[PDB]
């Protein structure tokens, strides 16, 4: 695989978002993945709707949490692959209350045909990401509360509790690392991103890795 990949440098990753006071991290992870996959299929980079998932995906629990794999399956099986634009279905749950699901009035921004669940293997995930783009991952982020920068090497790795987006890696660095897009504003971490060490299953990053499929 390439020594290092950074999909942000390639124009494939939208701005860092803010879930607000809502446990919708799973929807931010799934949507960020779709955004990147849609771009990488040759379409313009477009913000898509986390609210669609939070309000309408009843196999998940809105501001009380969810699974990115459930979100991808909902999009395909219950929403015929359609993912609405952010502009037409804007985020409204930042104070913890998700408005009721609505269908009419929204504009489809992207379409997916399925999703893949990747091996629980950091090298295989990296190699897949280099060719196929950013990957949704579940992590234990309990120990991320005071992170302000650097490569994390003792992430508490005990219980999957958060969903984020792998956007790159660097195997050439002194301490190889993953580059992760979080959804806690750009004031958190490294302009909204975190680097965790790569090779040691930091934060259980290998355990629940997946991606939408476009086309
Ligand atoms: C989002 C995580 S967070 O950004 O809120 C956060 C904050 C501080 C530290 C760490 C993370 C979301 C929070 C859901 C929540 C739960 C209780 C009270 C209030 C909000 N976490 C998740 O949605 C989580 C994502 C991991 C998916 N993978 C997995 N669980 N194997 N999933 C769930 O929380 N979740 C899914 C499973 N279901 C049985 C329980 C709820």
Author numbering: 1 to 215
Extract from the study:
The major cysteine protease of T. cruzi, cruzain, is an attractive target for the development of trypanocidal agents. Cruzain is expressed throughout the parasite life cycle and plays important roles in the survival of the organism, including immunoevasion, acquisition of nutrients, and parasite differentiation. X-ray crystal structures of cruzain in complex with reversible,and irreversible inhibitors have been reported, and the overall folding pattern and structure of the active site is highly homologous to papain. Seven substrate binding sites, four (S4, S3, S2, and S1) on the acyl side and three (S1′, S2′, and S3′) on the amino side of the scissile bond, form a cleft between two structural domains of the enzyme.
The catalytic triad of Cys25, His159, and Asn175, as well as the highly conserved Trp177, is contained within this cleft. Like most other papain-like cysteine proteases, the interaction of the S2 site of the enzyme with the complementary P2 residue is the key specificity determining factor. Cruzain is able to accommodate phenylalanine or arginine in the P2 position of the ligand due to the presence of Glu208 (cruzain numbering) found at the base of the S2 pocket, which can form a salt bridge with the positively charged arginine side chain.The vinyl sulfone warhead acts as a Michael acceptor for the active site Cys25, while the sulfone unit and the peptide framework provide several hydrogen bond acceptors that interact favorably with complementary residues in the active site. In recent years, K11777 (1), a selective cruzain inhibitor, has been demonstrated to eradicate T. cruzi infection in cell culture, mouse, and dog models. To date, all of our compounds contain a hydrophobic group at the P2 site. Herein, we report the synthesis of WRR-483 (2), the arginine variant of K11777, its remarkable biological properties, and a crystal structure of WRR-483 bound to cruzain.
